[PDB]
Amino acid sequence: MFSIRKIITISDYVTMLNIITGLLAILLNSFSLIYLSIIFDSLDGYVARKTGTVSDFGAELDSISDVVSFGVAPAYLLYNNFESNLALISAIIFCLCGALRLARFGILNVKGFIGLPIPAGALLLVGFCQLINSYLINSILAILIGLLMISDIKYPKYPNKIFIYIFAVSLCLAIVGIPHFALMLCLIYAIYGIIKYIRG
Question: Which one, of 114, 17, 118, lies nearest residue 58 by Cα?
Answer: 17
State the burial class of residue 149 (Cβ atoms within 10 Å of its Cβ: 0-12, 13-18, 19+): buried
Question: Residue 113 touches which of Ca ion, its own copies, Cl ion, none (CB < 5 to 8 A by kind)?
Answer: Cl ion
* Residues engaged in binding its own copies (CB under 8 A): 1-4, 7, 16, 19-20, 23-24, 26-27, 56-58, 60-61, 63-65, 67-68, 71-72, 75-76, 79-80, 88, 91-92, 95-96, 99-100, 102-104, 106-107, 114, 150-152
- Rounded to an integer, what distance in angstroms lies between the CA atom of residue 173 and that of residue 63? 25
Minimum CB separation of residue 182 from its own copies in Å reads: 24
Q: Which is nearer to Ca ion, 12 or 41 (CB)?
A: 41
Among 14, 44, 116, 193, binds Ca ion (CB under 5 A): 44
The b-or-e profile of 41-57 (16+ CB within 10 A means b, else e) is bbbbbebbeeeeeeeee
Per rule CB under 5 A, is residue 117 in the interface with Cl ion? yes
Question: Which one, of 197, 109, 179, 94, lies nearest residue 144 by Cα?
Answer: 94
Among 37, 41, 67, 149, binds Ca ion (CB under 5 A): 41
Binding stretches for Cl ion (CB under 5 A): 105, 113-114, 117-118
